[PDB]
Amino acid sequence: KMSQPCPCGSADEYSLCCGRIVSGERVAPDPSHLMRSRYCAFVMKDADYLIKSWHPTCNAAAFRDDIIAGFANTRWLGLTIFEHTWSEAENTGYVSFIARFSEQGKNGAIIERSRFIKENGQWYYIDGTRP
Amino acid sequence: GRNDPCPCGSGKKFKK
């Protein structure tokens, strides 16, 4: 009735899922959590988080405006993760996902395997490859 | 390719 299920699809309340991470209250334990959290930020148009979650070498602040601009063109309709891998030895991780959306009234889906890198206890997004 | 089990779980194609 008054539930606020997380936009990531976890069946958990946002406050207790991706929301505590985007709030800064909780560090993302793994690449999957970060991916989910970034998806929620896209859905909730945060951008500041999307920049904080972007690997520092990418200089995200510089393209903040383009992130905002992107918010207006797409409507997110769902996230489905089908693969996840990570290791402390590599400080690297991967998340394969399908993100469905709508653009100009036309539906579509993204299928990508994103890479995440860890720096000082925190995971950051960096790159991607179409699996 | 597209017809291999769509990881969406639809059971057949990414098209479908």
In a 13 Å sphere around the CA of A45, the CA atoms on its Cβ side amount to: 10
Nearest to A96 by CA among A124, A50, A123, A131: A131
Q: Which residues of chain A lie closer than 8 angstroms to B9, CB-CB?
A: 80
Token readout for B12 is 């057949």
Residue labelled with tokens 């793994």: A30
What residue of A is the nearest CA neighbor of B6?
A98
d(CA A104, CA A54): 27
Longest dimension (CA), chain B: 15
* Cα separation values, A106 from A80, A102, B14, Å: 19, 5, 16
The structure was resolved to a resolution in Å of 2.3
d(CA A51, CA A128): 16
Query: Could you give the strand order of the β-sheet that contains A92-103, starting from the edge strand earlier in sequence?
Result: A75-87, A92-103, A106-119, A122-129
Token readout for A34 is 């970060």
Distance from CA of B7 to the nearest CA of A (A): 6
d(CA A79, CA A114): 13
Tell me the domains of chain A and their CATH numbers.
14-129 (3.10.450.50)
Q: Which residues of chain A lie closer than 8 angstroms to B7, CB-CB?
A: 80, 82, 96, 98, 111
d(CA A76, CA A74): 6
Residue A1 three-state SS: coil
CA angle A112, A115, A121 (to 5 degrees): 145
d(CA A130, CA A111): 7
d(CA A15, CA A117): 25
